[PDB]
Amino acid sequence: RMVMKLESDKTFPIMLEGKINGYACVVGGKLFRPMHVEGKIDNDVLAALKTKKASKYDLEYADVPQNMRADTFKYTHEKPQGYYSWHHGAVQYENGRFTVPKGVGAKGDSGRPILDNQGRVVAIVLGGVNEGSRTALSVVMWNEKGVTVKYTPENCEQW
């Protein structure tokens, strides 16, 4: 069940001196990479792409080539309350916040798209701060009109 959401090769790791520190994800024909993550995307064609920064929203976006547009995530403008699927495990959406079990998400666990029960991306998580048992997440989502609202908990901890 949960293993049927990790067969997504469209995500790409970021290499820094041979180590992993973040993930760059392609959604809706555009490649999003977290700004604070330093490194180079393993894929050469995506690495060669020139990206335009966005300091306020803390991620840089680039336009993928035409031949790569076909195999790409699909975003969703509706975020129903309750269960969601992630690579590390289950996530739950309540009152506008994503929460995960403690210790989920750490060094190099940012830029991972959060998948829905249908199997399409709804948001991209950039960091998380621990709150008791359930760690809250700083995550950028997409509104119904397409304004890409960001929800960030207070004193957010990077990655």
Partner: peptide, 17 residues
């Protein structure tokens, strides 16, 4: 920039409004 980037970085890049 602050008025376009919320609409600019949408994956389908819809900026009518």
């Amino acid at each position: 920039v602050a008025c376009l980037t919320p609409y600019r970085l949408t994956p389908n890049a819809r900026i009518p409004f």
